Amino acid sequence: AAQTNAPWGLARISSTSPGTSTYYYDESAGQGSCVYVIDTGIEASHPEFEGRAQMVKTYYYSSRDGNGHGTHCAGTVGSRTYGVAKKTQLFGVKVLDDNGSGQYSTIIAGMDFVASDKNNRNCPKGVVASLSLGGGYSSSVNSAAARLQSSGVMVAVAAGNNNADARNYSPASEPSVCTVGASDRYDRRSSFSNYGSVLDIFGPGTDILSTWIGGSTRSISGTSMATPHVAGLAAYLMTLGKTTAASACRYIADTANKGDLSNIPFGTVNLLAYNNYQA
Ligand SMILES: [Pr+3]
Ligand SMILES: [Pr+3]
């Protein structure tokens, strides 16, 4: 299948070179997989989700996304127009308040929740969790991410936006998950993207158009935007049977565009998420 005039990030993950405008993908499009978006919530009623999005848990007074951030990330995972895996099932877990913040204890509870909740869902092709959040280093937060991964969920987390070594941030610094840096449409490391040896992969993160609350759209930037590209890519690959939750990050790294990025510090991987689609 082919989506013409796609957002640049979708086109980039189906090309060996920057500058293309078509997103090439297999028609299966992540059908039968599930992605938990652990964030500010999801505006599930947005037309772009086509009824495939559902709030399953909130840690605040409402399950509504009063912020937009979670809806944006969810859109990059699996919205019709802006999503990588256009037929995946989306589950929202609201661990961040409408200001975009949350206590570590709540974020940990949300991860433990997903590990259990997935056992009550029909996700025959597998389960992904997308975490576009983080803060200063915490061994408890890292441990929670490692548990979630161990439970059989592909965990993708943002590297952080501090232009620093991600070793000092959580859950970015947990080695066993998939830590995602950001790039721009000219294949440069995004100027805000964290780096370091703990990064596994880069994805498009600068000027990413996706869904927003109030049934709208907007373009924003961050490693928050790169992470759902990789989460959606994992769902897509799991549906195709190419990989499993345990090995998806490694498979994505193995099959990535290599050496294409500029402004990558020595010691950081030069790997850009790529779906390897061949008609
Ligand atoms: Pr290339
Ligand atoms: Pr890793």
Candidates 39, 65, 98, 187; catalytic one: 39
Rounded to the nearest 5 degrees, what angle is found at the Cα of 194, between the Cα atoms of 150 and 156? 25
Give dist(CA 196, CA 192) in Å, integer: 13
Give dist(CA 262, CA 183) in Å, integer: 9
* DSSP one-letter string for the chain: -EETT--HHHHHHT-SSSS---EE--TTTTTTEEEEEEES---TT-GGGTT-EEEEEESSS-SS-SSSHHHHHHHHHH-TTT-SSTT-EEEEEE-S-TTS---HHHHHHHHHHHHHHGGGS--TTEEEEEE---EE--HHHHHHHHHHHHTT-EEEEE--SSSSBGGGEETTT-TTSEEEEEE-TTSBBPTT--BSTT--EEEE-SSEEEEETTTEEEEE-SHHHHHHHHHHHHHHHHHHTS--TTTHHHHHHHTSEES--BSPPTTS--EE-------
Q: What does residue 112 show for φ and ψ, rounded to 5 degrees?
A: -65, -35
Neighbouring-strand partners of residue 91: 36, 54
- Structural domain total, the chain: 1
Residue pair 154/253 in contact (Cβ under 8 Å)? The answer is: no
Give dist(CA 253, CA 248) in Å, integer: 8
* Residues 169-182: b if buried by 16+ CB within 10 A, e if exposed: bbbbbbebbbbbbb
Give dist(CA 129, CA 29) in Å, integer: 17
* Nearest CA-CA partner of 79 in 124, 35, 131, 127: 35
How far is the centre of ligand 2, averaged over its atoms, from the C-alpha of 193 (Å)?
A: 16
Ligand that comes closest to the CA of residue 19: 1
Rounded to a whole number of angstroms, the CA Rg of the chain reads: 16
Largest CA distance in the chain: 47
Reply yes or no: is the peptide bond before residue 171 cis, omega within 30 of 0.
yes
Measured in angstroms, the resolution is 1.6
Give dist(CA 93, CA 84) in Å, integer: 20
Annotate 87-108 with three-state secondary structure. Answer: CCEEEEEECCCCCCCCCHHHHH
Give dist(CA 87, CA 53) in Å, integer: 10
CATH assignment at residue 1:
3.40.50.200
Backbone conformation region of residue 207, classed left if phi is above 0, alpha if psi is from -120 to 50, else beta: left
Q: Cβ contacts of residue 258 below 8 Å, gap of 6+?
A: 270, 271, 272
How far is the centre of ligand 2, averaged over its atoms, from the C-alpha of 91 (Å)?
A: 23
Query: Is 16 annotated as contributing to ligand binding?
Result: yes
The number of residues in the chain equals 279
Please return the burial class of 17, using the count of CB atoms within 10 Å of its CB with bins 0-12, 13-18 and 19+.
exposed
Candidates 132, 170, 221, 224; catalytic one: 224
Query: Is 260 annotated as contributing to ligand binding?
Result: yes
Candidates 14, 15, 46, 69; catalytic one: 69
Chain centroid, CA 259 distance in Å: 22
Token duo for residue 267: 């010691």
Segments forming the whole domain that contains residue 245: 1-279
In the residue annotation, 224 being an active-site residue is answered as yes
Neighbours of 57 (CB within 10 A): 18
Residue pair 192/162 in contact (Cβ under 8 Å)? The answer is: yes
In the residue annotation, 72 being an active-site residue is answered as no
Please return the burial class of 139, using the count of CB atoms within 10 Å of its CB with bins 0-12, 13-18 and 19+.
exposed
Q: What does residue 277 show for φ and ψ, rounded to 5 degrees?
A: -70, 135
Neighbours of 250 (CB within 10 A): 13
Name the method of structure determination.
Answer: X-ray
Sign of CA dihedral 220, 226, 229, 235: negative
In the residue annotation, 46 being an active-site residue is answered as no
Ligand that comes closest to the CA of residue 250: 2
Q: How far, CA to CA in Å, does 176 sit from each of 27, 111, 146, 147, 225? A: 31, 15, 6, 9, 21
